[PDB]
Design a protein around this ligand. Structure first.
Ligand SMILES: Nc1ncnc2c1ncn2[C@@H]1O[C@H](COP(=O)(O)OP(=O)(O)OP(=O)(O)O)[C@@H](O)[C@H]1O
Ligand SMILES: Nc1ncnc2c1ncn2[C@@H]1O[C@H](COP(=O)(O)OP(=O)(O)OP(=O)(O)O)[C@@H](O)[C@H]1O
Ligand code: SF4
Ligand SMILES: [Mg+2]
Ligand SMILES: [Mg+2]
Lengths: 519, 608, 325, 288
């Protein structure tokens, strides 16, 4: 099911309570579509206060949000016109009705046709031709210039709908809510920002037309990672994230809190530098170095006590719980005798310690930042590669300047950082795995890859698009682009009294049903 | 019950090395209406017996005897019990007045604190008022202005009078005062002894006084105790001891005082020999090595105090011979002045119209002025070469200031200083350092001028290792300086903090007589030395000037020593040279009505 | 000494105005403000990150940037973080928070340290000293994360044994504290107990060693003997005179214990969830902000320089022999 | 002469008759040797990963337990000692030397020397060395960092101690024996190193002793914030930094490296006490 939240019937819970959570920094900007405003946790907090078009299930499957829209449909699909209609009960915090102009204004704001807006991503608004008015003011028809397979993710997942007054001019976008968000329309409203104590309080929305939430308020405390566990230990907050086996042990042996886990979407990888001139500019060398690295031991050791049966990730597009996931790393299976065979049949002879082509030694440079949390993968890979005759010395960078100084300029041979999976994953691949993508930091690509990437996100069939996405994934596995290592387990330590809240995975919570167990 | 009773007291400091048996079994007593004086040689244990009685010896003292104040055996009482007597029944005056005062409290505060310890209902206003009254009674000038003077802003005599005031603040029943008059001139110590007498007559308060001079004893004390090498060695009345002494040591010591009826030269006779080691101390009388009367019996066992007359006791197995005879007879040793004298009159120091002034202020941070002290007011001084100039006068009258204005070779406030031809302002920095190779000084307070973290050898050798001496000369000179002054080899590994106090003063003299300077500035150089030892220092200084032609700037409050070795003297009062000239036209008849008073107030050593 | 003030205020104005020149140029060279935008899965389109670069300067000569900064830094405009939030108002917030956190713990820590060190000098090698010495060294040789976490373990045990929550350590006031005007002060003092304990342990441990070594020099002197001859008990004489003399080297240590720690309590404000001046420096560095760092060096200099005036004043008060100032 | 001994001869004799400080100098310098003689002796080298034995309590093959990666903790902490003890001793010595010379010169002379020296000191205090240590430290993993570290920790660690020494010297230079030494021709550096430094030395010693541990913990404070010595090379500071998190759940990982630091500071304090008693003549312990 991939979800573990201690499901209970909402009606059998308390009619009050105060959920208290923690952040890691006070949100600078309160606009989620702004570069300084988008974030994992800021969006997570806003999801309780803003509209969203679709509800994403435990495996990423989407269904229409009835509380905001009565029906969203793909109408005509010759230019792919999409029709949103809003139910005649949704109103903003100020009391003005939600109409089509909100949709039009938001997707013009993020369309990128005006450079004044400092958008964080385009999210497929770049492909929208025009937005007009349907039968009435509660209906918007969105016409696309070219087909977009991933259109349900425009106002879903991490994307919400913002009021037309906060996305209508560049000033309102960039600085409209620098010090507190604008109107909201969801089960809760933010009504206390204590910038000196750094705590945010969300109370019940008085004009919420949907289900009545069981909670009475949600309180966020800006806590450093060192204070997160001691605060949970004595009734100050009642949910953390126990990333390490250390925190897992301390939380597990604490009376009153129960740890619940579900695979998270973020993962790790090694990224190979195929830029012309690095040792790895040849495909066969990359495919032989990667057949001499044990990703399973990396997983099993770096996820020692967090999970049972720790496995690596074997997909560049989807994650373990997501549907359409499959094992595509069959071309780069571990077996190390073939790495030795191929490196011998490729030129690098075994001169005593490490392989040498002609005097030049087979020596690879590994760059990681955040030394403490990711030394684990640098050191295991080096140990298991030394047995083939590959050096792989570790260059732990500070993390202050990591991308800007090394990765974006190509001064690396293998770089390891993280990506984040999403319920709508197709938009990121045309930026990462394209030849001209802005995140293809290692300059490995082929016209075949581009021709397939700009064919998956053009198929308006929900399942056929997944098949094509796996074609693209099999191709990027076949040229040693990267080696996904492990996706983080979603071990969160929550108070055992909580219900309908916990580790969800790629799925989303609903906030009218989380509460405290009676008595 | 006697007001004090000591019996078989013995103090042996156990430092790193052989233990020093400072005191070995003494016993005496003091009565309420009576002053007892304890004279003796330097290093003989007097100021260790004093601290043993009072109870303020170090942690390693190892005292063992019996001392009782008024029936209460105070040798073993807890500090709480021995802090109900230590201010109200036992008032103590310490030898070194400089180190005895906390350097971060004004002297008025120190006296007021002493007052309010034993009467905490007085307060602070009344306590400070009465402390000011004490400052005036003792005799310090500008009491009100000088009450807030941190001890480093006082003269050497005022700094001692403050300690006396602290001792007599609460009118104690016993006064243990140690040489309470070594930094006071004649006409102020007259009144200090007067106030001690007042404490004897207006109250009870028998006094145990330890002095190195004998004129004070001849008129102040009632009984005498002669102490030598730890033992009390001769005991009698003050009048009977002076004319019927019967112990060879007291014959040699009572007959070696300065005479004041002498001229330049007149080598006074010291006791021939060296002081006892006080560590080995071979069996027999400790004075046997220096005795003209020593026989083989005197060495077998140590003699004890035997009765010889009415209230007269001598520790000497043959005294019937000493009866009647004189020091010139008992000691056939004769001292005659026949040196290789050098005569010249080329100026070496010429001070003209010197002026020095100090500012007086109150407060902790703001420090607003309240007055001034004209320490020097336009003196004119002149010292020839090969001659000495004796600076005498009232305590607190600028004598120590001028000595240190010449010595810091720099342009003074409002005068001119010319040392050995130079004008001190005309000097640079390298010519000045080369110049201070023949000029030295003995500081008035000898313990403060020696740092505590250097052994004795490094203190004496420090001058003559900054001017180019190898470690075969630096060592042969220190070995010969140690025995010139009378110290012992093996004291060169001791730190200055563990010496008697007349021994610390001989260290500073030895440090000054290295490098045989041409001008030697002496700030009361023989004040804490006893009569016999200081006689050999004067004989040393006099005979070291006839040859090598040294010229001393000699300032002291003993107008008898000055008579022996001063060609010219300069009486100095209130910061001005009241009178000056050769020490016959000013010692013979003084034509000014303060130097006549000072010369007419000297204590005559004959009790009758 | 009015003349002295007229000298030192200029001697410190030039110092401040030059130190907050070196830092601005050095951080303009070392810092890369836009990296945080790159370490983001949805990497902002290149256009809107070059636009952000041009927005906050970052392409003008460094001397020109500093000229602009100091142009309105003299009228309170201390700038704006990389994310639009003003810097001056946050500066006020953070200095307030750090003051309230540090005063109680530090002052009681140094008082306790002076007492413990002076006590250990009198009983130089006895069991009391040996025990206190190992305790001080134990505290000084462990990270403060560990000391504070041990405090938290103990407080949790007390809470779980009594049954009532009497130890609330995280934050600065009870999240959702209800009515009261007193019940506010009760809450504040309840939350100050553990942070103050951590700071006081560190301060006492550090100060006791210095006090011990400073007191051993004045232990055996003579004015203590004459103080005892006044009628003072050995204990009272030693304190009133010896300790009064021994405090002179410790004037500096304290006057700099008023400063320096403002930004060095980062780890105490990590575990307990306070936010000021130790968090802000680490945030400035980690976010690569030059305005934050400049606004911090200005204030920290304005404190560490007026702790060099108070220092000379206290030195000539504590010791009259220093005729310096 | 006969048997005349200098001051330093007496100081050495007095120091080596305090047996606590003699013992805790041989210990301090024998575990420095054992930090190099032992690593090529014991079964498991550092950076040897035992994936069979992850996070194990101390036992037979692993005498002090393992790590998260399986690295033998005993070998790891020995290699950490090699780097961290050298840096600690060097920082203590250099910081104390610079503080002593700067404070003594400025305090004893006054005038322009005082003004300019304290100008430089106050400049070094105002500028935040924390960024200069947070950015420079993660540059290059070699001796270069150990070097650049001491240059920065030692160069920005002496200012406070220099102020303390200057304050003490202003009162010391108004003494009477300082004046006597000046009157006798002693040069202003023989005065300083022969009269001022020994009479101020009771606090220099505590500075050295405390700066050992302070320098070792400065490089763990760096590792707590993400700066500091990087993974590939190990130092005792980084070992403690990685242990404090699991100081409660898996105590051995934190306890053993930290207990080494405690022992180092205890010995560095007992030796300091021995020397302090040697230089002070009024010490009561040396009164037999
Ligand atoms: N603290 C000490 N430690 C070791 N020896 C000491 C100490 N104090 C005094 N002595 C030694 O004890 C002996 C006598 O000392 P004391 O001060 O009692 O003599 P004194 O008769 O008072 O001499 P003076 O008349 O010169 O003051 C001397 O040899 C001296 O060196
Ligand atoms: N630093 C100072 N500040 C203020 N007044 C001082 C200072 N030093 C000395 N005096 C005063 O100047 C006067 C001169 O004292 P000086 O030091 O010359 O002693 P002196 O005349 O030799 O006295 P004695 O013969 O008792 O040693 C004294 O009244 C003293 O109180
Ligand atoms: S006992 Fe003998 S040696 Fe001693 S003083 Fe008398 S005659 Fe001289
Ligand atoms: Mg004496
Ligand atoms: Mg004088």
């Amino acid at each position: 099911t991939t979800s573990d939240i201690n499901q209970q019937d909402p009606a059998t819970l308390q009619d009050g309570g105060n959920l208290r959570l923690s952040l890691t920094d006070f949100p600078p900007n309160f606009n989620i579509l702004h570069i300084d405003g988008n974030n994992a946790e800021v969006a997570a907090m806003m999801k309780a206060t803003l509209p969203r078009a679709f509800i994403i299930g435990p495996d990423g499957s989407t269904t229409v949000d009835t509380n905001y829209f009565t029906s969203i449909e793909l109408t005509r699909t010759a230019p792919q016109v999409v029709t949103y209609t809003i139910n005649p009960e949704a109103v903003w915090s100020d009391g003005t009705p939600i109409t089509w102009r909100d949709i039009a204004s938001q997707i013009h704001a993020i369309s990128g046709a005006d450079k004044a807006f400092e958008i964080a991503s385009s999210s497929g608004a770049e492909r929208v031709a025009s937005v007009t008015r349907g039968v009435d003011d509660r209906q918007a028809v969105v016409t696309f210039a070219k087909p977009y397979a991933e259109w349900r993710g425009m106002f879903a997942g991490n994307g919400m709908l913002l009021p037309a007054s906060m996305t209508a001019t560049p000033e309102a976008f960039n600085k409209g809510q620098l010090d507190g968000p604008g109107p909201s329309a969801g089960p809760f409203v933010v009504s206390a920002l204590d910038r000196t104590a750094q705590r945010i309080v969300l109370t019940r929305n008085p004009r919420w037309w949907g289900a009545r939430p069981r909670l009475d308020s949600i309180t966020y405390l800006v806590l450093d990672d060192a204070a997160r566990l001691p605060a949970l230990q004595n009734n100050t907050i009642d949910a953390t994230g126990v990333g390490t086996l250390d925190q897992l042990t301390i939380a597990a042996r604490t009376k009153g809190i129960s740890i619940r886990r579900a695979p998270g979407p973020s993962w790790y990888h090694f990224t190979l530098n195929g830029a012309p001139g690095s040792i790895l500019a040849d495909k066969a060398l990359r495919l032989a170095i990667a057949k001499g690295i044990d990703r399973y031991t990396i997983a099993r050791v770096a996820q020692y006590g967090l999970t049972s049966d720790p496995v690596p990730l074997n997909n560049h597009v989807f994650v373990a719980g997501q549907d359409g996931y499959q094992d595509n790393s069959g071309v780069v299976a571990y077996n190390p005798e073939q790495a030795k065979r191929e490196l011998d049949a490729l030129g690098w002879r075994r001169s005593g310690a490490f392989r040498e082509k002609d005097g030049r030694q087979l020596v690879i440079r590994d760059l990681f930042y955040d030394a403490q949390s990711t030394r684990q993968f640098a050191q295991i890979a080096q140990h298991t590669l030394a047995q083939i005759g590959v050096k792989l010395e570790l260059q732990a960078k500070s993390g202050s300047g990591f991308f800007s100084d090394y990765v974006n300029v190509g001064a690396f041979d293998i770089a390891q950082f993280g990506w984040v999976g999403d319920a709508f994953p197709l938009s990121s691949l045309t930026q990462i795995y394209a030849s001209d993508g802005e995140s293809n930091f290692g300059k490995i690509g082929s016209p075949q890859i581009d021709a397939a990437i700009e064919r998956t996100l053009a198929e308006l069939d929900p399942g056929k698009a997944r098949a094509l996405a796996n074609q693209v994934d099999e191709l990027i596995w076949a040229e040693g682009f990267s080696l996904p290592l492990t996706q983080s387990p979603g071990t969160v330590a929550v108070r055992s009294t909580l219900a309908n809240f916990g580790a969800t995975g790629l799925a989303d919570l609903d906030y009218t049903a989380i509460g405290f167990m009676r008595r | 019950s006697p007001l004090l009773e000591v019996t078989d007291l013995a103090v042996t400091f156990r430092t790193d090395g052989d233990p020093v048996t400072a005191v070995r079994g003494i016993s005496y007593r003091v009565e309420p209406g009576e002053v007892v004086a304890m004279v003796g040689e330097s290093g003989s244990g007097k100021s260790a017996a004093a601290m043993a009685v009072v109870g303020l010896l170090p942690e390693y003292a190892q005292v063992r005897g019996s001392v009782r104040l008024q029936g209460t055996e105070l040798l073993g009482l807890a500090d709480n019990a021995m802090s109900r007597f230590r201010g109200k029944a036992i008032g103590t005056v310490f030898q070194d007045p400089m180190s005895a005062l906390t350097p971060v409290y004004t002297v008025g505060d120190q006296i007021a604190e002493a007052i309010e310890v034993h009467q905490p209902r007085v307060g602070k206003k009344a306590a400070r008022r009465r402390a000011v009254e004490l400052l005036d009674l003792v005799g310090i000038s500008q009491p009100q202005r000088r009450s807030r003077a941190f001890p480093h802003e006082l003269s050497g005599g005022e700094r001692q009078r403050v300690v006396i005031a602290i001792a007599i603040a609460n009118d104690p029943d016993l006064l243990i005062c140690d040489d309470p008059t070594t930094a006071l001139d004649v006409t102020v110590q007259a009144q200090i002894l007067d106030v001690l007498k007042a404490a004897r007559d207006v109250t009870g308060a028998g006094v145990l006084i330890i002095t190195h001079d004998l004129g004070v004893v001849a008129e102040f004390a009632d009984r005498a105790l002669v102490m030598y090498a730890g033992r009390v060695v001769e005991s009698a009345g003050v009048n009977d001891l002076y004319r019927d002494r019967r112990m060879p040591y007291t014959v040699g010591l009572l007959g070696s005082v300065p005479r004041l009826d002498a001229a330049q030269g007149t080598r006074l006779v010291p006791i021939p020999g060296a002081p006892p080691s006080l560590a080995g101390l071979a069996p027999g009388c400790p004075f046997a090595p220096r005795c003209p009367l020593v026989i083989d019996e005197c060495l077998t066992a140590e003699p004890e105090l035997l009765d010889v007359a009415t209230d007269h006791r001598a520790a000497c197995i043959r005294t019937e011979l000493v009866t009647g005879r004189s020091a010139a007879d008992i000691y056939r040793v004769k001292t005659e002045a026949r040196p290789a004298a050098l005569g010249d009159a080329s100026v070496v120091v010429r001070v003209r119209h010197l002026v020095k002034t100090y500012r007086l202020a109150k407060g902790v941070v703001l420090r607003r002025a309240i007055g001034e002290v004209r320490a020097v007011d336009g003196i004119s001084l002149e010292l020839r070469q090969g001659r000495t100039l004796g600076i005498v006068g009232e305590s607190g009258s600028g004598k120590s200031t001028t000595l240190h204005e010449i010595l810091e070779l720099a342009a003074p406030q409002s005068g001119s200083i010319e040392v050995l031809g130079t004008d001190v302002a005309t000097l640079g920095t390298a010519e000045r350092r080369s110049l201070r190779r023949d000029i030295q000084v003995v500081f008035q307070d000898p313990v403060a001028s020696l740092d505590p973290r250097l052994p004795v050898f490094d203190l004496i050798a420090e001058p003559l290792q900054a001017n180019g001496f190898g470690k075969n000369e630096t060592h042969a000179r220190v070995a010969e300086l140690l025995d010139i002054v009378g110290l012992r080899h093996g004291d060169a590994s001791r730190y200055p903090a563990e010496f008697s106090g007349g021994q610390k003063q001989r260290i500073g003299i030895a440090r000054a007589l290295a490098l045989q300077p041409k001008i030697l500035a002496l700030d009361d150089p023989v004040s804490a030395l006893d009569v016999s030892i200081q006689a050999g220092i004067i004989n040393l200084l006099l005979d070291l000037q006839e040859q090598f032609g040294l010229s001393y700037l000699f300032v002291s409050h003993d107008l008898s020593v000055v008579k022996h070795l001063a060609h010219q003297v300069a009486v100095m009062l209130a910061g001005t040279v009241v009178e000056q000239g050769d020490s016959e036209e000013v010692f013979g008849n003084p034509k000014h009505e303060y130097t006549r008073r000072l010369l007419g107030a000297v204590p005559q050593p004959d009790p009758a | 000494m009015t003349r002295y003030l007229a000298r030192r205020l200029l001697n410190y104005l030039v110092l401040l105005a030059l130190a907050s020149f070196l830092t601005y140029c050095l951080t303009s060279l070392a810092f890369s403000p836009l990296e945080s935008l790159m370490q983001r899965s949805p990497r902002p389109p290149q256009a809107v990150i070059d636009a952000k670069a041009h927005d906050l300067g970052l392409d003008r000569p460094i001397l020109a940037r500093y000229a602009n900064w100091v142009s309105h830094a003299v009228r309170g405009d201390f700038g704006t973080t990389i994310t639009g939030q003003p810097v001056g108002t946050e500066l006020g917030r953070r200095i307030g928070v750090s003051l309230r956190l540090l005063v109680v713990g530090s002052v009681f820590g140094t008082v306790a340290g002076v007492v413990i060190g002076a006590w250990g000098a009198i009983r130089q090698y006895r069991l009391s000293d040996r025990v206190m010495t190992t305790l001080a060294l134990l505290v000084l040789s462990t990270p403060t994360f560990v000391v504070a976490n041990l405090l938290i373990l103990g407080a949790l045990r007390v809470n779980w044994a009594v049954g009532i929550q009497l130890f609330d350590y995280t934050g600065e006031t009870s999240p959702g504290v209800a009515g009261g005007v007193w019940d506010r002060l009760g809450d504040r003092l309840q939350h100050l107990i553990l942070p103050s304990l951590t700071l006081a342990l560190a301060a006492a441990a550090g100060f006791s060693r210095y006090q011990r070594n400073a007191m051993l020099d004045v232990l055996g002197q003579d004015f203590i003997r004459t103080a005892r001859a006044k009628g003072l008990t050995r204990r009272r004489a030693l304190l009133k005179h010896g300790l009064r003399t021994a405090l002179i080297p410790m004037a500096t240590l304290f006057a700099y214990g008023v400063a320096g720690l403002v930004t060095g309590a980062v780890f105490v404000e990590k575990i307990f969830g306070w936010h000021g001046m130790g968090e802000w420096m680490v945030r400035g560095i980690s976010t690569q902000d030059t305005n934050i760092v400049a606004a911090i060096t200005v204030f920290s200099g304005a404190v560490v320089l007026l702790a060099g005036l108070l220092s000379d004043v206290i030195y000539a008060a504590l010791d009259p022999r220093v005729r310096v100032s | 002469m006969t048997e005349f001994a200098s001051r330093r001869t007496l100081v050495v004799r007095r120091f080596l008759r305090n047996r606590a400080a003699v013992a805790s100098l041989a210990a301090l310098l024998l575990l420095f040797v054992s930090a190099y003689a032992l690593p090529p002796l014991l079964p498991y080298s550092y950076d040897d990963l035992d994936f069979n034995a992850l996070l194990q309590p101390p036992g037979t093959k692993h005498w002090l337990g393992t790590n998260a990666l399986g690295q033998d903790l005993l070998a790891q902490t020995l290699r950490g000692m090699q780097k961290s003890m050298l840096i600690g001793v060097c920082v203590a010595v250099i910081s104390t030397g610079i503080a002593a010379t700067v404070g003594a010169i400025s305090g004893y002379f006054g005038g322009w020397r005082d003004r300019t020296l304290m100008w430089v000191v106050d400049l070094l205090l105002v500028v935040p060395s924390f960024i200069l240590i947070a950015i420079v430290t993660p540059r290059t993993k070699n001796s270069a960092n150990i070097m650049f570290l001491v240059l920065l920790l030692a160069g920005f660690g002496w200012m406070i101690s220099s102020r303390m020494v200057r304050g003490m010297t202003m009162s010391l230079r108004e003494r009477e024996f300082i004046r006597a030494a000046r009157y006798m021709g002693v040069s202003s550096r023989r005065i300083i190193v022969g009269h001022v430094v020994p009479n101020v030395a009771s606090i220099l010693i505590i500075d050295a002793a405390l700066n050992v541990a302070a320098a070792i913990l400065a490089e763990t404070g760096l590792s707590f914030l993400g700066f500091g010595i990087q993974p590939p090379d190990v130092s005792l500071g980084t070992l403690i930094a990685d242990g404090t998190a699991s100081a409660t759940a898996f105590p051995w990982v934190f306890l053993f490296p930290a207990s080494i630091l405690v022992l180092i500071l205890v010995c560095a304090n007992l030796t300091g006490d021995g020397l302090r008693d040697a230089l002070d003549p009024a010490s009561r312990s040396l009164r037999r």
